Design a protein around this nucleic acid. Structure first.
Ligand SMILES: O=P(O)(O)O[C@H]1[C@@H](OP(=O)(O)O)[C@@H](OP(=O)(O)O)[C@@H](OP(=O)(O)O)[C@@H](OP(=O)(O)O)[C@H]1OP(=O)(O)O
Ligand SMILES: [Mg+2]
Ligand SMILES: [Mg+2]
Ligand SMILES: [Zn+2]
Ligand SMILES: [Zn+2]
Lengths: 241, 193, 113, 93, 199, 255
RNA sequence: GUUCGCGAAGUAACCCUUCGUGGACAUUUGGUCAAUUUGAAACAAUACAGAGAUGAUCAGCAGUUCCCCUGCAUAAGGAUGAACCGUUUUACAAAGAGAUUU
RNA sequence: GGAGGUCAACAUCAAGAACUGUGGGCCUUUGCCUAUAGAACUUAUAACGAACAUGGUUCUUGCCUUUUACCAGAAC
C-alpha cells in the first residue's frame, strides 16, 4: 500500500517479500522509484520473519518432522546473509552474522562429536538470542526512519532546508562571505549613496586583484583612489595567507 | 481487509501506513515467543488494531532457569540420538513457499489438522520420577501453588529431589567447574589488563 | 552568524548574522524558540538586557531596534544613524547603550529610547 | 538609573514562563515519544452567555495526528501605519 | 501564532437552545475553506441525542474579517448572508461595499493574514453605525410604499404561481415564456369544467 | 402520498455494481481505486439505475428520527437498504426545505460541504458564495444515442423528466447549442435533480433503442453560469430588489 | 432478570406455587468519516530534439527563486537538478550663442 | 475478610558507604553539634538485567574515486 500510494505500480512485491520491476524502466522512473534503506530494511525483516513462520507452518501441515523443523530454523538463523540480504542495507548487521557463524563453530563440534558430518543439529537457542538482541537495537532507529518517511508521504517536504557547510561547499562559502566583508567596508568609505548597481562593478577589482596575486603580476590600477586600494590589498593579503 | 476497494477503507489504509513505525516491535514480540522444540503449539495473547492494521503479541516468556536448562539438555540429547539413528536426514528446502503463493489461511488449511509429534526425549519411569509429569509443558508448574506463586509465573521454589533430578538431567549443559582457581588468567580482570 | 550575546538571567542565547533575523535559542533543548523578524540587512550586534527592552540589535540598514521578546514586535526603532551600525556597547552601571557608525557615535537611553 | 532588583525578577519570571510554554509546545508536537519525558508542567463562555465545555478527543495512534499539518509556502502581508521617520542630520571618488 | 489563539465565534442559532454544550477542540483539524490554512476545528452537537454533528469550517481570521459565524457563514449581528448584507449596505450610503474574493491559492492565504475587516463588515462590526443604517432603512421603507391555451402571461412570472393558483382555484403545465403559449392541461375534463366554473 | 407506504428497496446489495471499474489501463492501483499505465479521456458510461419517484419513494428509518438530509443513493437510483436507510427517501417539498434552512447556507441537501469556488468545469457540489438554482443539461446527443429528434420534442422530454423531481421556475432549450437551462423554485430541488439525473438517458420505452439504451455516454447535468441575456439580468435585478425589501422589513422589525 | 419484603389464593401449617404490589441492583454507544462517473495522486505511448561557461568535448562547487523530486537525513544526488540569458529614458540643472514677440 | 492476576495508576532505584523523622542547644531560615525512632529493593572480583543491543558529537586510526553504508579504539 506504500508502494501504490507513492505512484509506483510497476514494482511488484511478491509474497516472499521481493521487490522486482514488471518491465524495463526508464531513467526518469528509476529516479522516481529509488526506495530508501528504510523500506528495504523493513522488507528484509519481514522476509526473515516470513521464513521462520513458514517453517513452523510446514511442521503443522505434517510435511516435515520435529527434528527437520529444528534443523530447518537453526539453518535459517545461521544463514540470514544468504537467505535475506539485510547485509547490504545496514552493514552493521554483519557483526550479528559473524556472531552466528562463530556460534555455529562452537555448537557443531559439541554436537558432531562422535557422530559424523550430516545436517540435523537444531540447537537454535544461541543464534535466536543474537537476532533478538539485534532487533531491540533497531527498534528506535526504524521508528525514526519510517516516521520521517511516512510524514514525507502525508505532509510533503519542509521548504525550510538549510545547507550545512561541509568540505564540498567550503571554498564557495569563503568567497561569498569574503565579498560581503569587502563590500561593506567599501560602501562605508563612499561619501555618496552608491546606488546599488555600482557595487557589483566595484567587486571586479577584488576578483582581478586576486588573479593578479596568483600570477605574481603587481596589480596597479591607474586611477584608483587610495583607501579603496588599501582595502582590496588588505583582503587579498588575508585570502593569500 | 483482504481486498479493500471502496470509498470505505480510506481511513483504514492510512492506519496501515501508520503502523509501519511499529512493525519492528510487532516482529520482536512475535519472534521472541517462538514456541520451542518440545512444544507443539502455544497460545499467545495478542493486542490488535480494530481496523486490522497490526497485531502485537502481548506476552513475555518467563521460564524457570534450571527447568529450562533441563529442557534444552533433554532435547540436545534427543537430537544427537536422532542424528545418529537416521541414515538419511532430509534437511528441508528454502524458501519453503513459492513466491506467487499467498500465505494460506490458518482457519481452513491449518487449524483442522491434528498436530504432530515434538522432540520429547523419553524419560525413565523411576530415575526421573519427580520431573516426568511436567518437564515438557509450556509453563511447567503454572498452577501448582506450592511450587510457584501463581499464574503470573514470577517466583519458584522446589524441594530437594526435584532440584537434584533437574541437576542430573541437565548434564550436557552444566558448567562443571567448581573451583575458582580454574579461571586464573581467564577471569574478567585479566582480560581488562 | 556574526554575533553572540548571553542573557543575564534566563538561560538564552541570542545570535544573528546575514540571516536578517535574531534567534533566541533555548539553552537546554537547543530549540530556536523565538525569532525576531524586523530588519532589512545583516545584523552586526546584539546585546541582551535583563528588563523589558530585552534585546537591543543594530543592523546594516541604519536602524537600531529595541525588542519586546515576549510579544514579538519592536518597542522602538532608532533611525538616527546614516549608515550601517557596526558596533554597540552596553554600559555596566547606567542602563544605556552606545551605537557607532561610520563617524557617528551616539548614546541612547533604554526603556525610553 | 539601573533597573531595580524587583523589575529584574518580574521580567525574569514572566519571560521564563513564556519560554517554557513555547518549549513544551515544541516538544509536545514532535513525533518522538521520548520528548514528552522532557516537558515540565477548560471552560470558555461563547456569547453573552452559553457555558460550553471544551473537551479534547482521544485519537488513533496509527492515523496521522494534526491532519491539517502539511508543508506549505506562505507570503505574509507586511502591514504598518507607523510611518517612522528617518531622523538624520541636515571627483576624487 | 498558536500560543494565544482567539476563542471562536459560534452563532447563537448554531449553538442551539440547550444551556450546556460540550465541544471538541482538535488543534489542527481541517484546513479552512476560505483561508486554505490549518486551524483548530470544533465539532459540537446541539442536544446530546441530535442526529447530526455541527462542526466549524472557517478560520478565526477568516471569520473576523467578514464578521461572521464559523458554523453558519452568516453575519454575526444581523444573521444574514454576506451577499445580501453587502447589498443592504451598498444600497444605502451608495458606496458599492462589495466583498473582494481571492482565487490563486497563494493570494487567498495571503489575504487571510492581513487584518483589515473585509468589505461590508466594517459597519456591522460596530453597533453604532449598524444601528444608524437601520435608521436609514426605515426611511427607504417609508419612501417605498382538458387542454387550455393561455395567452398574455407576464414575462417574468413562473409556472408554479399559475399551478398554485389553479390548485387554489379547484395536472400538467407547459409554459414557454418567450412565445407566451401557456399550454395548460388538466388530468380530467371534469376538472376543466370545474376550473371554467370557478373563474 | 409517500407518507403511507414504507420505501421500497431499489436494488439488492448483491446486485450492486462492483468496484475495480471497467479495466481502463494496464495495472490496478490500490491506494487510489483506479487504473495505471493507462489511457483515459472518456471514463464515462450510462448509469444502469434510475429512480422512479412515484414507485420508490416512501417512509424510512430515519424519517421517524427527523433527519434533515436526503439519501444520495435514493436519488442516484441504487439505494440498497429500503426502510432501514438512515436518510430520507422522498422528493424535497416545502416542509423538508423549511427544515434545512439553517444548514443549506453551508452544505448541501444531501449533507455535503459546499466549497469556496465551483470547479474548472462546474462540477458536483455548489459553491457557498452564490445560491445558484439553474442547471445546465448537455451531452444530449450522447444521451439519445444520436437519434435526431426535432428539438421541441427534446425540450418536451427534458420538461417531463424534471417535472417529477420538484417545482420548476422555468425551462429553456437552446436551438443553436445542444443544451438546456432549468431553473427550479428552491435550491434543494436543484441539488437533488442534479445528482438524480446525472449520467442518465432521455429514452423511454416506445423509442426503438430502449433495449439498447445502455450503450453510450449519457447526459451531463452541471451548474449553469450567469445568464448574459439582458432580460434575464433585469429580471434578476428586480427579484434582488424585492428580496432586499423583504429583508429590510425583517431587519427593521428586529430592532 | 435477581433480591428483600407486604397481601390474596392451592395444598396449607410456616413450606410451596400462581398472582398483585413497595424498595434495592443496573442508566445515554457512534460519526471531522454515506456505497462506481460530477470535488480533484500521477506516470506511461506515438512525434520532435540529444545536456552549461565551446572553436570541440567535458569535471564541478555555489547563489537568487511565491519550482521542486529521491532520500533516515542538518549527508548526498536529480544535466554544475532546473528556471537565470529578456525588456531598458524624467531627483534634469548652469553658463554662452542664433532667430520670433513684447 | 482470604488466595490469586503475563490488570492499571503513582512514588522509587547508584550515593561524603551513601536514608528519613523527631526533640534540645548555637548561628540567623539554611547550616553545625547533641539525644532518639524507623530503613523495603539494589550493591564489594561493586549493581536494578549472573542478560546485553543501537543512535549522536569530537579525537585517533583502517578500507581509499566522493557521500551514505562501513573498519575499531577513546571521551562525553
Ligand atoms: O556454511 P556451509 O557452507 O553451509 O557449511 C557449514 C560450514 O561452513 P562454515 O564453517 O563456513 O560456516 C562448514 O563447512 P566448511 O566450509 O568449514 O568445510 C561445516 O563443516 P565442518 O563440519 O567440517 O566444520 C558444516 O558442514 P557440516 O554440516 O558437515 O557440519 C556447515 O554445514 P551447515 O551449513 O549444515 O552448518
Ligand atoms: Mg545548481
Ligand atoms: Mg546539487
Ligand atoms: Zn482561515
Ligand atoms: Zn437510502
Amino acid at each position: 500500500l506504500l508502494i501504490h500510494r507513492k505512484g509506483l505500480t510497476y514494482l511488484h512485491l511478491d509474497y516472499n517479500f521481493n521487490l522486482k520491476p514488471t518491465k524495463t524502466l526508464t531513467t526518469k522512473e528509476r529516479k522516481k522509484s529509488r526506495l530508501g534503506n528504510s523500506f528495504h530494511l523493513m522488507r528484509e525483516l519481514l522476509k526473515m520473519m516470513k521464513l521462520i513462520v513458514d517453517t513452523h507452518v510446514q511442521f503443522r501441515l505434517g510435511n516435515v518432522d520435529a527434528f527437520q523443523l529444528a534443523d530447518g530454523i537453526h539453518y535459517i538463523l545461521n544463514h540470514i546473509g544468504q537467505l535475506t540480504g539485510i547485509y547490504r542495507y545496514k552493514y552493521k548487521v554483519m557483526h550479528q552474522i559473524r556472531a552466528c557463524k562463530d556460534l555455529k563453530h562452537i555448537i557443531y563440534y559439541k554436537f558432531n562429536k562422535n557422530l559424523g558430518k550430516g545436517p540435523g543439529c537444531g540447537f537454535w537457542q544461541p543464534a535466536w538470542r543474537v537476532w533478538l538482541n539485534f532487533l531491540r537495537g533497531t527498534i528506535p532507529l526504524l521508528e525514526r526512519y519510517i516516521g520521517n518517511l511516512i510524514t514525507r508521504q502525508f505532509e510533503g517536504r519542509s521548504n525550510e532546508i538549510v545547507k550545512t557547510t561541509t568540505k564540498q561547499r567550503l571554498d564557495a562559502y569563503y568567497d561569498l562571505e569574503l565579498r560581503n566583508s569587502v563590500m561593506d567596508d567599501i560602501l562605508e568609505m563612499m561619501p555618496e549613496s552608491i546606488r546599488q548597481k555600482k557595487a557589483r562593478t566595484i567587486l571586479q577589482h577584488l576578483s582581478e586583484a586576486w588573479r593578479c596575486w596568483k600570477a605574481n603580476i603587481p596589480w596597479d590600477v591607474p586611477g584608483m583612489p587610495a583607501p579603496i586600494k588599501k582595502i582590496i590589498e588588505r583582503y587579498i593579503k588575508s585570502k593569500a595567507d | 481487509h483482504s481486498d479493500m476497494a471502496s470509498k470505505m477503507y480510506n481511513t483504514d489504509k492510512k492506519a496501515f501506513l501508520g503502523a509501519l513505525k511499529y512493525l519492528p516491535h510487532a516482529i520482536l514480540k512475535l519472534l521472541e515467543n517462538m514456541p520451542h522444540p518440545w512444544e507443539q503449539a502455544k497460545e499467545v495473547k495478542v493486542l490488535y488494531h480494530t481496523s486490522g492494521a497490526i497485531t502485537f503479541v502481548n506476552e513475555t516468556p518467563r521460564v524457570i532457569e534450571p527447568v529450562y536448562t533441563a529442557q534444552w539438555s533433554a532435547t540436545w540429547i534427543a537430537m544427537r540420538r536422532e542424528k545418529r539413528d537416521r541414515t538419511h536426514f532430509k534437511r528441508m528446502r528454502f524458501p519453503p513457499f513459492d513466491d506467487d503463493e499467498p500465505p494460506l489461511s490458518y482457519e481452513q488449511h491449518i487449524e483442522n489438522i491434528e498436530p504432530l509429534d515434538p522432540i520429547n526425549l523419553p524419560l525413565d519411569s523411576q530415575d526421573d520420577e519427580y520431573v516426568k509429569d511436567w518437564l515438557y509443558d509450556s509453563r511447567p508448574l503454572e498452577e501448582d501453588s506450592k511450587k510457584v506463586n501463581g499464574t503470573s509465573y514470577k517466583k519458584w521454589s522446589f524441594d530437594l529431589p526435584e532440584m537434584s533430578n533437574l541437576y542430573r538431567l541437565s548434564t550436557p549443559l552444566r558448567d562443571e567447574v567448581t573451583d575458582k582457581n580454574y579461571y586464573y588468567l581467564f577471569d574478567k580482570k585479566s582480560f581488562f589488563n | 552568524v556574526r554575533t553572540v550575546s548571553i542573557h543575564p538571567t534566563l538561560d538564552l542565547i541570542a545570535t544573528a548574522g546575514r540571516d536578517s533575523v535574531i534567534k533566541l535559542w533555548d539553552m537546554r533543548t537547543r530549540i530556536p524558540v523565538i525569532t525576531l523578524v524586523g530588519h532589512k540587512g545583516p545584523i552586526n550586534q546584539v546585546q541582551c538586557t535583563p528588563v523589558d527592552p530585552q534585546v537591543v540589535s543594530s543592523s546594516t540598514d541604519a536602524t537600531v531596534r529595541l525588542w519586546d521578546v515576549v510579544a514579538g514586535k519592536t518597542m522602538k526603532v532608532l533611525t538616527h544613524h546614516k549608515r550601517s551600525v557596526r558596533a554597540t556597547a552596553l554600559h555596566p552601571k547606567e542602563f544605556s547603550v552606545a551605537s557607532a557608525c561610520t563617524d557617528d557615535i551616539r548614546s541612547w537611553g533604554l526603556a525610553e529610547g | 538609573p539601573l533597573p531595580t532588583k524587583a523589575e529584574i525578577q518580574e521580567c525574569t519570571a514572566r519571560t521564563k514562563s513564556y519560554i517554557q510554554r513555547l518549549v513544551n509546545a515544541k516538544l509536545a508536537n514532535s513525533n518522538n515519544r521520548a520528548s514528552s519525558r522532557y516537558v515540565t508542567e477548560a471552560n470558555l463562555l461563547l456569547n453573552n452567555s452559553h457555558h460550553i465545555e471544551v473537551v479534547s478527543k482521544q485519537m488513533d495512534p496509527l492515523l496521522p495526528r494534526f491532519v491539517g499539518k502539511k508543508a506549505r509556502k506562505v507570503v505574509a502581508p507586511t502591514e504598518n501605519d507607523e510611518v517612522v521617520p528617518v531622523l538624520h542630520m541636515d571627483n576624487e571618488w | 501564532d498558536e500560543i494565544n489563539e482567539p476563542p471562536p465565534n459560534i452563532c447563537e442559532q448554531c449553538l442551539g437552545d440547550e444551556a450546556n454544550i460540550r465541544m471538541t477542540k482538535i488543534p489542527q483539524g481541517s484546513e479552512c475553506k476560505i483561508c486554505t490554512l490549518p486551524f483548530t476545528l470544533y465539532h459540537f452537537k446541539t442536544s446530546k441525542r441530535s442526529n447530526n454533528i455541527i462542526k466549524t469550517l472557517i478560520c478565526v481570521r477568516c471569520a473576523t474579517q467578514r464578521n461572521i459565524c464559523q458554523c453558519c457563514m452568516l453575519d454575526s449581528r444581523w444573521h444574514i448572508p454576506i451577499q445580501l448584507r453587502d447589498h443592504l449596505i451598498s444600497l444605502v450610503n451608495e458606496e458599492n461595499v462589495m466583498t473582494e474574493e481571492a482565487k490563486n491559492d497563494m493570494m487567498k492565504r495571503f489575504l487571510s493574514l492581513k487584518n483589515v475587516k473585509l468589505g461590508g463588515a466594517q459597519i456591522t462590526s460596530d453597533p453604532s453605525e449598524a444601528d444608524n443604517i437601520v435608521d436609514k432603512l426605515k426611511n427607504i421603507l417609508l419612501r417605498a410604499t382538458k387542454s387550455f391555451f393561455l395567452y398574455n402571461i407576464d414575462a417574468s412570472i413562473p409556472e408554479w404561481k399559475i399551478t398554485d393558483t389553479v390548485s387554489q382555484l379547484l395536472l400538467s403545465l407547459i409554459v414557454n415564456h418567450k412565445a407566451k403559449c401557456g399550454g395548460l392541461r388538466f388530468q380530467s375534463s371534469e376538472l376543466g369544467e370545474r376550473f371554467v366554473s370557478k373563474i | 402520498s409517500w407518507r403511507d407506504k414504507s420505501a421500497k428497496v431499489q436494488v439488492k446489495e448483491s446486485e450492486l455494481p462492483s468496484s475495480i471499474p471497467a479495466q481502463t489501463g494496464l495495472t490496478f492501483n490500490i491506494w487510489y481505486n483506479k487504473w495505471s499505465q493507462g489511457f483515459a479521456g472518456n471514463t464515462r458510461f450510462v448509469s444502469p439505475f434510475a429512480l422512479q419517484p412515484q414507485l420508490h419513494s416512501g417512509k424510512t428509518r430515519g424519517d421517524n428520527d427527523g433527519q434533515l438530509f436526503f439519501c444520495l443513493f435514493f436519488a442516484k437510483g441504487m439505494c440498497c437498504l429500503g426502510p432501514k436507510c438512515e436518510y430520507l427517501h422522498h422528493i424535497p417539498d416545502e416542509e423538508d426545505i423549511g427544515k434545512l434552512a439553517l444548514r443549506t447556507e453551508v452544505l448541501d441537501c444531501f449533507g455535503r460541504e459546499k466549497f469556496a469556488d465551483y470547479r474548472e468545469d462546474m462540477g458536483g457540489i455548489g459553491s457557498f458564495r452564490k445560491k445558484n438554482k439553474t442547471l445546465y443539461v448537455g451531452g444530449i446527443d450522447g444521451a439519445l444515442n444520436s437519434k435526431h429528434l426535432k428539438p421541441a420534442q427534446i425540450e418536451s422530454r427534458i420538461r417531463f423528466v424534471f417535472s417529477r423531481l420538484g417545482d420548476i421556475d422555468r425551462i429553456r432549450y437552446v436551438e443553436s447549442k445542444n443544451c438546456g437551462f432549468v431553473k427550479f423554485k428552491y435550491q434543494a430541488n436543484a441539488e437533488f435533480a442534479k445528482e438524480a439525473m446525472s449520467n442518465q438517458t432521455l429514452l423511454l420505452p416506445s423509442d426503438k433503442e430502449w433495449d439498447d439504451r445502455r450503450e453510450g455516454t449519457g447526459l451531463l447535468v452541471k451548474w449553469a453560469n450567469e445568464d448574459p441575456d439582458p432580460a434575464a439580468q433585469k429580471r434578476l435585478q428586480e427579484e434582488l430588489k424585492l428580496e432586499s425589501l423583504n429583508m429590510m422589513v425583517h431587519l427593521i422589525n428586529n430592532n
